[PDB]
Design a protein around this ligand. Sequence first.
Ligand SMILES: CCCCCCCCCCCCCCCC(=O)O[C@H](COC(=O)CCCCCCC[C@@H](C)CCCCCCCCC)COP(=O)(O)O[C@H]1[C@H](O)[C@H](O)[C@H](O)[C@@H](O)[C@@H]1O
Ligand SMILES: CCCCCCCCCCCCCCCC(=O)O[C@H](COC(=O)CCCCCCC[C@@H](C)CCCCCCCCC)COP(=O)(O)O[C@H]1[C@H](O)[C@H](O)[C@H](O)[C@@H](O)[C@@H]1O
Ligand SMILES: CCCCCCCC/C=C\CCCCCCCC(=O)OC[C@H](COP(=O)(O)OCCN)OC(=O)CCCCCCCCCCCCCCC
Ligand code: HEC
Ligand code: HEM
Ligand SMILES: CCCCCCCCCCCCCCCC(=O)OC[C@H](C)OC(=O)CCCCCCCC[C@@H](C)CCCCCCCC
Ligand SMILES: *C(=O)CCCCCCCCCCCCCCC
Ligand code: FES
Ligand SMILES: [Cu+2]
Ligand SMILES: [Cu+2]
Lengths: 158, 54, 139, 103, 160, 223, 163, 312, 92
Amino acid sequence: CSAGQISQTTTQEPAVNGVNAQAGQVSLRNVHLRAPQQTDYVEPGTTVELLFVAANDSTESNKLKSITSDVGEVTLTGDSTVPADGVLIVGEPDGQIQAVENAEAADAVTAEVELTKPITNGLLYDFTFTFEDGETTVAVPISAGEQPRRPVPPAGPG
Amino acid sequence: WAALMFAASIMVHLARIFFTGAFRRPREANWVIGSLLLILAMFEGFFGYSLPDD
Amino acid sequence: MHIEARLFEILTAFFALAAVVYAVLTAMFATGGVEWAGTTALVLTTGLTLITGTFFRFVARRLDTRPEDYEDAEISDGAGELGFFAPHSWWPILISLSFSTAAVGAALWLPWLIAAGVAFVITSVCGLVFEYYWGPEKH
Amino acid sequence: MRTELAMPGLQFLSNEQFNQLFTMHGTVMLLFYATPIVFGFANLVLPLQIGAPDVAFPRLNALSFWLFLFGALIAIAGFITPGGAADFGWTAYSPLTDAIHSP
Amino acid sequence: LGLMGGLLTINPIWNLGPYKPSQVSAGSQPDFYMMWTDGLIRLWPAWEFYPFGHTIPQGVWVAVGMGLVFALLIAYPFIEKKVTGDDAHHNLLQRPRDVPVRTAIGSMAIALYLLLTFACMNDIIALKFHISLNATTWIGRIGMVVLPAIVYFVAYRWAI
Amino acid sequence: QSALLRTGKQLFETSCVSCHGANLQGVPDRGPSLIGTGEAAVYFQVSTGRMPAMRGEAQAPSKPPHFDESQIDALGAYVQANGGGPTVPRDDHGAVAQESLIGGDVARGGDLFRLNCASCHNFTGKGGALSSGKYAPDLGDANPAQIYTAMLTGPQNMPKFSDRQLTPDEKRDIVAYVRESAETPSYGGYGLGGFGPAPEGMAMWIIGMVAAIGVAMWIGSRA
Amino acid sequence: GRPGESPFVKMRPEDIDAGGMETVFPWRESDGDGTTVESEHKLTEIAMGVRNPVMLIRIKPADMHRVIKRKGQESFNFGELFAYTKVCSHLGCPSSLYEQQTYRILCPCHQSQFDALEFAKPIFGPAARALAQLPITIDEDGYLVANGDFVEPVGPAFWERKS
Amino acid sequence: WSDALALGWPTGITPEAKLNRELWIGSVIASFAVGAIVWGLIFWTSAFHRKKATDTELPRQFGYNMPLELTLTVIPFLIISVLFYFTVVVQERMMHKDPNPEVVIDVTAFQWNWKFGYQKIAFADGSFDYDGADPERKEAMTSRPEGKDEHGIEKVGPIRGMTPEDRTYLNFDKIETLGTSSEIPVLVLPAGKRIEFVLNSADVIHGFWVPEFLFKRDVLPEPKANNSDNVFQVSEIQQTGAFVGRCTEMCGTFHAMMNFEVRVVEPNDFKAYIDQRNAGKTNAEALAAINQPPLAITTEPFESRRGELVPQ
Amino acid sequence: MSSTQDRSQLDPEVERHTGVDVEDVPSAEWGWSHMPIGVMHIGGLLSAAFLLVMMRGNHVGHVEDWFLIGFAAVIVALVGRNWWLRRRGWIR
Ligand SMILES: CCCCCCCCCCCCCCCC(=O)O[C@H](COC(=O)CCCCCCC[C@@H](C)CCCCCCCCC)COP(=O)(O)O[C@H]1[C@H](O)[C@H](O)[C@H](O)[C@@H](O)[C@@H]1O
Ligand SMILES: CCCCCCCCCCCCCCCC(=O)O[C@H](COC(=O)CCCCCCC[C@@H](C)CCCCCCCCC)COP(=O)(O)O[C@H]1[C@H](O)[C@H](O)[C@H](O)[C@@H](O)[C@@H]1O
Ligand SMILES: CCCCCCCC/C=C\CCCCCCCC(=O)OC[C@H](COP(=O)(O)OCCN)OC(=O)CCCCCCCCCCCCCCC
Ligand code: HEC
Ligand code: HEM
Ligand SMILES: CCCCCCCCCCCCCCCC(=O)OC[C@H](C)OC(=O)CCCCCCCC[C@@H](C)CCCCCCCC
Ligand SMILES: *C(=O)CCCCCCCCCCCCCCC
Ligand code: FES
Ligand SMILES: [Cu+2]
Ligand SMILES: [Cu+2]
């Protein structure tokens, strides 16, 4: 009776770095920050990108995506009202394929944030995604999409 | 394999003697020392397969 | 064994008729011709009953009217030495357990538990068959 | 299955737990209660009814019972497994039964 | 023994890498003779006592269990003679059926030993025979008090 | 590719939208969202066959794949385009790399396997048991791409080994060790599975002890 | 797994990804690579330390809200990174098995599970004491460093404990 | 009286359903007559109790009434023969297989939901120059020049040269009304027209039932290779509105979650719907545009939650 | 016919005059044949108590506790039935 109403397989989040925020009609999937850090912190004043996918649940739509801004002044370049029983893919997560030579509306709604606050990988930073339906804090992580190991200096025994 | 058969045959011999009553009045001390022998065999195999640091 | 053979002869007649009619009406008037599953099953159940009935008829012709087959047969007529009916035996349960250990080995695809269940089955079938033939121990 | 079906919602059973129930209920009742009990009654009175002392192969009919009992148990054994018993109904139709479906 | 040394592989230490505290496998079993001690360790239900500023880990439970097992095994003939009352010089064995209580007790003890031995192997039993690991652990826990009683009753009646 | 994306979408729509809802968002309490899972996850999971899954239980078992390599690639490309994530390795031609994933070093691969993989699988990649009905499966069926992608995407109750955590060279070494341990013949006889104590004790008790007892019964006299 | 040279390499939080487990060891700058003879003995000591190995777990941000924290171990975690001793609290075998989406640290020796979401308290098996939690953080350059020592003895329990 | 005596048969919405319901009413009449007479016989012989007045004298002890046996073994044969003749004439209108369907729906039934393709539409009155999509049908012929061996094998494929995972039998169309787990599919059909259903299954055998059609068919994976007549026609659908439809087989775990709808709208409504779907719009959007509720009104989507006591 | 009857004189030493009888255990004189019923009753009661006590443990599970409850309940039911029947003289 591992197959009962509470089963391990069904109640599993995706094995992805981005968090999931189902609150609100539009569901946020694989929401993370591309913020390549060269040191302990990503210093304020540097622009890091905000990846996620906004999937519409209802066909009756919530395609506004008004502000979705928090501490950092997230700006949505090439903003569009995409979600209509479909996906709004704000950016290009590492490994993303354009899927066609051309493109629609230039960039596909790329969200970029001027930090105004140090951030580091491993921490969770709250972002308030607000559609016309409602607002939800998501606690976005920092994800190193596909970058390999940065060479750490060799150690001199002492 | 000889260690495993040693343990298994000690166990089977213990079963035989216990079930056939080969320990009462005489041979009771024989049963006692046989029990000590079984314990020693158990720990001997324990130290044996533990001997090659693995 | 006239009635015993004739029962299977009747079953053979009916099953042969069913197989023939199914084969014909499936070769024609079916979406994809002969079904080839029902046809074969009907043909070989006809074969089942045919084998049994043929053996029963051979035996009926080979044997004179038994008291069992003979109406107006007194109990004393059949009274005599009935043959060997196996008394108590614990080999059937061992055979069942061995076949169950082979079956679980087949279900859970464990070649080692199949191999052992089959060994187990051979041993227990040998025990059952030799149960009443293992001569006295010769020391 | 009956308690679950009393109310429209899935009160206490999951979809696959219910599917295991009618699968095993159907087979247990037929193949482990109905088909093995005709030979239960046959072994009971058939030799008596024809005047015989015993069945033709009385060690064989002993094997038949134990094959029934142990064969039945290993079918019920699907429940103790974490996945459960067979999802597919008693009929166990082909595509649903292959390794791809109900693995 | 030579045939089995040839044809059957025992303890492939080359497969089993060198000991490192940070590394481990899933099997982690001792030979079948210590498998009952290991199974006792696995099955015993994590009962720990914390006296004044001290700890009494679950290891002591299994240690005392082994001590009791060995003490009872060593002292059985004297226990049996104290219980029954027979100190007569016995040179003729008695068939296990002819002594229902002792054969029943031995069957009960063998059942407990087999339960513990398979509890130690519950990991591989769960892996191969598809049974949840928690289910195997709790089957062992319940059986080690149920299975000995069942086997005792069955063996007693079987002997009679 | 356009047609590859279209084929992946068509397969997705008639295979998994019931439990990975259309738009790749996950169906609450039936399946996780596939956004960000990537092409490697799709390749491993569908090729091992786990994904045409017909039950919610402790663990999704392996099974014959329901799609051929081309359809696996189509589904993987569709999922990668929708979400974007890890990609399965490929060789010079374009096919999923099998031999290229065999790392040169096998001692290093074995050390890494023992530190990370043997934790649950085995000393040599046989299976292992887990908490509640789960289990780490035997690795002898997995091919180098399947092993590499299994590490790349933690399939289920398995830690997700990123390239940063296990550089592709380390993963290649682990793949080499897995394949070598799986394809290597047992020296010293029939390795009874791969678990020492339990299969060895059973084989003793069944082969050696029945032989000894039967020989003793032959030599001696019943009484 | 490099055979002998630079066996231990500094680590960064970005290296792990959500639902990831990595076995880490207490490496000091003085304990440089294994090239020298002075090194390769400190490194061997680190590797052979019974209480040295730790498992660093990246809790999925979605499940970060299910985390319960122990007394005095509330700030030990660095964001979504939790460092628990691998040595099982009961008889000291490593608890190396990790189940993500269940967050259960399983020990192979005697099948004991610890709930990593909560403080690694045993929710099954013989173990009765939670695994010790290592304080962790990032120094300059972002490399992960222990922010202290275990607030309790880390190996298996013994008579002189809990005081 | 007819509804009560039909034993819960939904009054058909197509002439085939009407005729089948009439046959069912007749069959139930005959069965209830037989049951009434037999139960009367049983409750009458239950009046032959062992009366205390019965002295030491046993009954007639007759048995073996050959003429009565002949009568009661010939009459049932005639009854079943009449039933069989009616059954055959009714079955004749099970699939008339009219070579000129007015709308053809490609009913793909995959694992735990439905998809409707609208393969072709050709109104007899004259309209709907529409067709399906010949592309998207990609085979899986594993005709590699060489396999694992060095030479000679040149394996073509397991079955008829194709691998089991082929899905060439599956036909695809431009307008696909796929059903999501959270959005029950609604196949909209024109009222008054001949509607053919080309049935197929993606993964597993299962069933397609519209209780109001008084007819069901088993969507098979490869019906043509299995010697099955998956395709079946409905001459007309008079009544408009939404009719629930179930899956009437075993599919897997979520077999009870395959409910769909068939929404019979007027021919003009179907014109507007198909035009607005050719224009990029979803099924719900097209329904709203033709001013009909977008979501399945006869059945809500099932809660994807595994049950009530699950902690969300 | 090729079998010789056996004469056995085993040394005896409780005298079996109380406890079990040959009609109940045919080989009562040949070995230990009687376990006091109190021993088995107390053993069953303590087994049930142990099963119940195992509910207290470090397991978040609940079907485990329910299985313990069921097994302890059936053990206690068997012990109670046996004790009641023997109290009344094996009646009902
Ligand atoms: C009586 C004395 C004789 C003793 C037996 C001696 C047999 C000698 C055999 C010949 C020499 C040694 C061959 C060594 C080559 C070799 O090892 O043999 C494997 C086979 O292995 C299997 O499957 C088992 C096949 C079934 C046959 C053997 C069964 C014998 C058992 C029953 C003996 C013990 C008794 C236990 C009784 C049980 C009942 C208890 C009540 C074959 O390869 P494979 O199959 O592919 O192994 C997989 C890797 O590939 C893959 O990666 C890896 O991941 C794995 O999956 C691995 O299995
Ligand atoms: C030596 C063996 C003989 C033993 C004799 C003693 C007999 C007494 C057996 C006692 C059985 C105790 C069973 C209960 C144990 C227990 O408490 O664990 C459960 C699992 O229940 C179960 O299946 C119960 C299965 C019980 C079947 C027992 C079968 C007896 C067999 C072994 C007898 C054959 C013996 C063969 C002898 C061989 C002879 C060799 C010579 C739950 O685990 P879990 O899986 O985590 O479930 C989670 C949900 O709860 C949660 O909602 C959900 O959310 C999920 O998380 C889900 O996973
Ligand atoms: C004849 C009896 C017939 C009884 C048949 C009943 C079968 C139905 C069982 C499971 C159905 C699938 C549901 C699967 C999920 C469970 C339901 C639930 O959620 O119920 C609430 C809590 C747990 O809360 P939780 O959220 O699971 O989390 C927890 C920690 N996190 O348990 C409770 O109080 C209520 C108890 C729930 C199940 C306990 C059943 C176990 C064994 C019964 C007796 C065995 C007797 C042996 C005799 C020798
Ligand atoms: C419920 C039935 C089911 C269906 C059918 C199914 N999935 Fe899934 N999927 C799951 C579950 C449950 C998980 C997570 C647990 C697991 O994978 O065992 C999952 C996870 C996945 C993953 C891995 C996610 C990760 O984070 O690693 C991939 C990739 C995936 N699904 C793709 C597919 C594709 C492609 C198909 C169709 C070819 C499909 N699935 C069909 C239920 C299903
Ligand atoms: C008395 C009963 C004994 C038992 C039960 C026993 C058991 C064992 C076992 C099981 C092993 C493991 C072998 C392996 O893993 O390959 C072992 C190893 C060993 N035994 Fe014993 N042994 C016994 C007596 C002896 C004796 C008398 C000697 C010396 C004369 C001895 C010398 C060794 C050595 C040197 C090893 C190490 C072999 C290795 O590491 O592979 N043992 N023993
Ligand atoms: C006292 C000892 C005697 C028993 C006393 C009366 C014993 C009476 C036992 C009532 C049992 C009640 C259970 C209530 C279920 C529950 O609420 O928990 C749900 C749980 C989550 O679901 C499961 O996990 C599996 C549940 C199914 C159990 C399959 C067992 C199949 C057994 C086979 C493996 C054959 C074994 C051979 C057995 C051989 C014996 C044959 C009878
Ligand atoms: C998951 O591991 C199993 C799910 C099965 C749940 C439903 C169980 C139905 C009851 C079965 C009865 C077993 C035999 C009872 C013996 C008294
Ligand atoms: S050694 Fe970890 S639970 Fe016992
Ligand atoms: Cu259905
Ligand atoms: Cu279906």
